[PDB]
Amino acid sequence: SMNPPPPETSNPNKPKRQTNQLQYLLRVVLKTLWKHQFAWPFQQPVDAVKLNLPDYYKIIKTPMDMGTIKKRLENNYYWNAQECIQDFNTMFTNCYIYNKPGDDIVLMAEALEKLFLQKINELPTEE
Numbered sequence: 326s327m328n329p330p331p332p333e334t335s336n337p338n339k340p341k342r343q344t345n346q347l348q349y350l351l352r353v354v355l356k357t358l359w360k361h362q363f364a365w366p367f368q369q370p371v372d373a374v375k376l377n378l379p380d381y382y383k384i385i386k387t388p389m390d391m392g393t394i395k396k397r398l399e400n401n402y403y404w405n406a407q408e409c410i411q412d413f414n415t416m417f418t419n420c421y422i423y424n425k426p427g428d429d430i431v432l433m434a435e436a437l438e439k440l441f442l443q444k445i446n447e448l449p450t451e452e
């Protein structure tokens with residue numbers, strides 16, 4: 326019935342780098358989704374205690390949210406752009422696992438995912 330700890334946003338043992346693709350993911354992809362009309366349900370981990378959703382973390386074992394992704398990018402947690410893209414896709418996948426067609430949260434996820442795909446399809450080349 327408790328929330329899990331949020332996903333780690335730094336691993337002090339991992340090497341760190343900046344790349345044009347990671348810059349794109351933070352400054353173009355995440356930033357565009359973050360200011361979207363439908364961003365607010367996805368800006369932080371699902372708080373299953375405050376929202377009284379005790380089955381959420383019984384169903385969702387790989388939680389992910391844009392707040393975690395944003396912190397991961399700002400902390401240089403990701404070495405490969407693919408790692409971050411996987412996290413965005415996990416976030417959307419979780420929403421479709423837990424919810425149903427026609428749900429408000431699903432219509433919001435679909436709109437955000439459409440925008441995510443438009444931006445990720447312009448990911449710059451590997452410098």
Ligand SMILES: COc1ccc(S(=O)(=O)N2CCCCC2)cc1NC(=O)c1[nH]c(C)c2c1CCCCC2=O
Pocket residue numbers: 365366367369371372375376419420423424430
């Ligand atoms: C009724 O839902 C809410 C009511 C109020 C607020 S809040 O922004 O006022 N605030 C959030 C931070 C803590 C204080 C309250 C947010 C929500 N929900 C969500 O954020 C959310 N986000 C997701 C991904 C999902 C959900 C819930 C629907 C099913 C599971 C799911 O998939």
